[PDB]
Structures are given as C-alpha cells and as structure tokens.
C-alpha cells in the first residue's frame, strides 16, 4: 500500500509486487498539512494568526529542506480524479485558513473592516504564488525567504500591528 | 496543399488542439488536419511541436510584455498608476477572453518558457517600481526588486487559484485585490485609489 505509493507501468516492479496513484500521492501529503491548518482555529488557543503563520512558515521550510516532499507537492500543483483532488485540497485549505482568520477577527486581531473570507483568499493566493514561483525558478523565488516575506506582507494587510512578530520563524506548535 | 498554409492558421489550429487535448496528446498530424492540411503544413513553419507551442505562447505573452515595458517610461510620471492600468486590464482580458485564458493556462500549468517569461515580467515590473522610487512614490526603504517579486507571487497565485477553482478565486476581483494589497505594502498612501478601475493605458 504505502510501498506502492512510495514506489510511485513499472510502479509495481519498483515496489517489488505482483491518475489514481498520483491522486493517492497528493492525498497522503495533503492530510498532515490540512490537520495542521485545522488546528490553527482551535477555540482552545488565543493566537490564531500567530499559529496560522507558524504553520505556513514551517511548511515552506520543510518543503525547502525535503526534496522528496517538494516533488510530491509539485504534482499536487500540476495540470479527472487528480483534478478533483486539487480542487478538494484548494477548498479545504481555504476553508481552514478562513476559520483561523474568523477566530482572529473574533479576538480583535484583524484590522477594522477586514473580512476573514477575503483575507483567506489573499493568503491562499500568496502561498500558491510562492510555491509556483519557486517550482519554476528557485533562484528567483526562495521558499523560505520569499515565502516569509510574502506571508508577512499579506498578513500585515489584514492583521493589526503587534499580533505577531514579522521576519522571524516562530516556535513549533 | 501544405505549402499554402499560413503561419497564423497553423498557430490558430494548434492553439485549439492544445486547448482541447493538452500539449502531450496533440500531434503534428492533428494540428495539420485541424488547419485543413497535413503534418507537412506544420513543418513548413515549425521544426517540431515545441516550436509550435513556443510560438503560441509568444503570441499571447509578448503583447503583455510590451505593455508592462511602457509603465517605466521617462515620458510619464505615473508609473504606479500605469502598472495598475496594465495589470487590471490584463486580468479583465483574461477573464473575458476564453482563447486568451486557455493559452495562459497551458503556459502556467505546464519549463524554460516559464522561466524566461517570469524573468521578463519581473524585470519590467522592477523597472516601473524603480521609476516610482525615483519619483518618490515608494514608501521609505521599499526595495523595488522585492516589491516586484511580491507582486509576481501574489498575482501568479491568483492566476493559479482561478484556473483550479474559478468558483472560489476570481481572476478580475482577486487579481485587482492582490495587486492593490501588494502595491499598498510598498507604495506611499495617496499615490493611487485602491479598488478603482483605471482608464486603459494610452
């Protein structure tokens, strides 16, 4: 099962055994990040912008430092089962980002008039553009350095000053 | 009669095939047939399918580059407004022109063509923002090269998101918002009015 996904018509032969594959691959990688994003809106903690920012930054760092993971993530960003998986992943991520920003709004951490739905779209666009720009040319778009700059810029548009410390990598959740 | 095929006709046929079948599954025979000829008509103009795809991409991409180039001109003093004018009217054209949009889609969700295109766009945006800085329109310490990189990332993400899920990311609405949000981070307040639809560039 995992052996098959790891190997992935010599997939079986690489695996050593006797589209759905690419989808199963994007799913296995999506999951961990989704659960991390979901945690950022927990009503059990009161720093949702900080936590959301931490999750995104740590994710950019792991992709930058893990070639296997970055290649997997790559196919999740290419090009009906795979197409539907990407859409599902898109929807899920934007949903979870919006829950965390709606909690920030609730806690008084967004700027006056900020709409968490609109903030979440801009944040999602920011993340996607850094990923895609780094995929095309890492020498012009550095996942860790530009990822943080872009994230802090977009967050600063909707989040009040003093809610998080820009420019630094936060502690693990 | 293969040698009578025109370059534009071969390109128009090729774009339709690429849009419908994808680049991988499109053949030279198919493009020729689509245009009303055979593979030889394609060869009359292009060495191979890569050259065809590159010509399709250049045809759409290059007008956009010429427009972005104009935004940094010495003969006008509103580089930020001019950049917004170019970018916003581009988002609108891509939203409203299906042909234009599907060719944008083949180019983005595809190697070296993208790298070159990204470098071209970043240079021109940077040059417009360098004129903005010369004219005192950037906020203190704003680096035009960084601002150009951020604008490209936010806009590229809106394009990709709109391609994946047009119900959730709107090229026109979200492209203007990303553009204005990014400009606001690097451009002095009161240089432009966010959310407004500018006149197209002269």
Q: Per the CB < 8 Å rule, is A157 touching B181?
A: yes
Burial class (CB in 10 A: 0-12, 13-18, 19+), B78: middle
CA gap B12, A129 in Å, rounded = 30
Give A24 to chain B, closest Cα distance, Å: 18
SS3 B194: coil
CA gap A85, A80 in Å, rounded = 9
CATH of A1-173, one of 1.10.443.10, 1.10.10.10, 1.10.357.10, 3.40.50.720: 1.10.357.10
CA gap B66, B86 in Å, rounded = 10
CA gap A119, A57 in Å, rounded = 17
Q: DSSP character for B192?
A: S
Q: Which of A129, A135, A147, A149 is nearest to A56 (CA)?
A: A147
Q: Which of B86, B8, B75 is nearest to B41 (CA)?
A: B8
SS3 A10: coil
Could you tell me the sign of the dihedral formed by the alpha carbons of A72, B121, A58, A161, in that order? negative
Chain B residues with CB under 8 Å of A118 CB are 177
Residue of B113, B139, B157 to mutate when probing chain A, most A C-beta within 10 A:
B157
Crossing angle of helices A20-39 and A81-106, in 10° steps, is: 0
CB B10 within 8 A of CB B52: yes
CA gap A56, B201 in Å, rounded = 38
DSSP per residue, A72-126: HHHHTT---HHHHHHHHHHHHHHHHHHHHHHHHHHTT-BPTT--HHHHHHHHHHH
SS3 B138: strand
CA gap B165, A125 in Å, rounded = 12
Is B152 near chain A, with CB under 8 Å? yes
Q: Which of B91, B109, B15 is nearest to B55 (CA)?
A: B15
Chain B residues with CB under 8 Å of A157 CB are 181, 184-185
Give B195 to chain A, closest Cα distance, Å: 14
Q: Per the CB < 8 Å rule, is B156 touching A133?
A: yes
Give A97 to chain B, closest Cα distance, Å: 14
CA gap B94, A115 in Å, rounded = 26
CB B201 within 8 A of CB B67: yes
Name where chain B breaks: residue before each gap, C-N > 2.5 Å. Answer: 110
Buried/exposed A44-78: b ≥16 CB within 10 Å, e otherwise: eeebbbbbbbbbbbbbbebbbeeeeebebbeebbe
**Side-chain half-sphere CA neighbours of A80 within 13 A:** 0
Burial class (CB in 10 A: 0-12, 13-18, 19+), B32: buried
Q: How far is CA B187 from the centre of its chain?
A: 23
Per-domain residue ranges of chain A: 1-173
Is A157 near chain B, with CB under 8 Å? yes
CB B47 within 8 A of CB B38: no
Q: Which of B114, B149, B161 sits opposite A124 (nearest CB)?
A: B161
Resolution, Å (one decimal):
2.0
CB A15 within 8 A of CB A4: yes
Q: B182: which residues sit within 8 A by CB, 6+ positions away?
A: A153, B147, B150, B151, B154, B155
CB B198 within 8 A of CB B85: yes
Could you tell me the sign of the dihedral formed by the alpha carbons of B154, B157, B162, B163, in that order? positive
| Main-chain phi, psi angles of B187, to 5 degrees | -110, 135
Is A132 near chain B, with CB under 8 Å? yes
Method by which the coordinates were obtained: X-ray
CB atoms within 10 A of CB B77: 13
What kind and span of H or E run contains B174?
Answer: helix B171-186
Does the domain at B1-202 match CATH 1.10.357.10? Answer given as: yes
| C-alpha dist (Å) from residue B63 to A78, B78, B86 | 26, 21, 11
Chain B residues with CB under 8 Å of A150 CB are 150, 153-154
Q: Which of B122, B161, B177 sits opposite A90 (nearest CB)?
A: B161
């Amino acid at each position: 099962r995992e052996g098959i996904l790891d190997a992935a018509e010599m997939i079986g032969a690489r695996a050593g055994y006797t589209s759905e594959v690419l989808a199963a691959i994007v799913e296995r990688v999506h999951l961990p990040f989704m659960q991390e994003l979901e945690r950022t809106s927990t009503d059990q903690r009161d720093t949702p912008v900080h936590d959301l920012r931490a999750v995104m930054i740590h994710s950019f760092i792991e992709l930058s430092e893990d070639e296997r993971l970055r290649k997997t993530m790559e196919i999740m960003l290419r090009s009906r089962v795979l197409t539907e998986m990407q859409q599902a992943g898109f929807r899920d991520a934007l949903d979870r980002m919006e829950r965390a920003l709606r909690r920030a709004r609730d806690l008084g951490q967004l700027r006056e008039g900020a709409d968490p739905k609109i903030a979440a779209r801009m944040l999602h666009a920011t993340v996607l553009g850094v990923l895609h720009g780094a995929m095309v040319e890492p020498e012009l778009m550095d996942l860790k350095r530009d990822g943080m700059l872009a994230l802090d810029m977009t967050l600063a548009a909707y989040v009040k000053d003093g809610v998080f410390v820009p420019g630094t990598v936060p502690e693990p959740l």
